[PDB]
Design a protein around this ligand. Structure first.
Ligand SMILES: Cc1cc2nc3c(=O)[nH]c(=O)nc-3n(C[C@H](O)[C@H](O)[C@H](O)CO)c2cc1C
Ligand SMILES: [Zn+2]
Ligand SMILES: [Zn+2]
Lengths: 175, 175
């Protein structure tokens, strides 16, 4: 019955968005493990702070059944995602997202998180919140202009500044 | 003429509160440096994340005139402050807050940040916003129950959840 959350942090990752999830989980006693979307668990933030997380994204593949939810913390790695699309960690990212979406896991994200989910196709026929610049990239999903969208098991926010509009409902759904 | 900000992060520090400042500073081209209120450059967050900042608080002394603002990021280190009040890094904390207060630098903080400010007497006759649990610990200052208090050069918030009520003003003050 005990839930488990897999948190995905890109490199670099928006620290404000990330530690809104993590500090909320810790204070509510929600278990979580943070995975780096890179070849090392030592990442940076957009602000420049060096951050050493729990593990890498490669060690998440095959362990999707051990978690009940997935969190995509957006960052400045996304505006250059297309350049590094063929990077090992960026390939593992789409695979992890795809598997979690098929298991029916709780999909959580913000900013460009909806687009990364939509690149797979798990957001088909689902209301999602996404950054105004990543909105025309939403093909399978149904992008809205709302600060946050909760449809089925998809919990998305427009950016890191509108996470507060959905975070309590995310918390009460986990523990 | 370039406004430089000195950010003080405790150990452990509330990650959500800290990166609300740093990411906001980054997106607005505000120069800042993060000093660890601990023995070493490497600290952790309340969530458990290993965080490596810029420098230690000891290397801030004598260089307070090289900054225009002082930020106090509260954390779980404060409820254990009375036990470690005689620690070298906690002694340096009170001495750098004093120095920044003498030159009339922009004093920023949240949660129990106003309490640490009031422990020096810099907040005399000044309205401050502080955590409800730390409110009776305000003798020199004028503690309120408001989310944020801006009085003169003091910019305090009730906790990490009410930083957004004063942060736009902080950014404008730092350009
Ligand atoms: C932790 C956190 C809590 C917030 N809470 C609120 C809130 O209660 N009401 C609100 O209108 N905006 C809230 N915001 C967003 C905030 O109003 C906005 O991002 C800017 O401060 C003003 O545009 C919050 C943002 C963060 C990061
Ligand atoms: Zn983003
Ligand atoms: Zn605190």
């Amino acid at each position: 019955m005990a839930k488990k959350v897999a948190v995905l942090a890109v490199n670099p990752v928006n620290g404000c968005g990330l530690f809104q999830y993590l500090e909320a989980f810790f204070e509510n006693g929600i278990s979580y493990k943070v995975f780096a979307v890179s070849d090392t668990k030592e990442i940076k933030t957009n602000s420049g702070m060096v951050l050493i997380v729990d593990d890498v994204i490669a060690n998440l593949k095959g362990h999707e059944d051990e978690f009940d939810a997935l969190v995509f913390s957006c960052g400045d790695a996304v505006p250059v995602f297309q350049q590094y699309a063929n990077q090992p960690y960026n390939v593992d990212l789409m695979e992890v997202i795809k598997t979690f979406g098929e298991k029916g896991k709780m999909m959580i994200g913000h900013c460009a998180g909806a687009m990364m989910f939509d690149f797979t196709g798990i957001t088909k026929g689902k209301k999602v919140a996404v950054h105004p610049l990543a909105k025309p990239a939403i093909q399978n999903g149904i992008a809205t202009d709302e600060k946050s969208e909760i449809d089925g098991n998809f919990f998305t926010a427009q950016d890191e500044n509108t996470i507060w509009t959905m975070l309590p409902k995310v918390i009460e759904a986990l523990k």
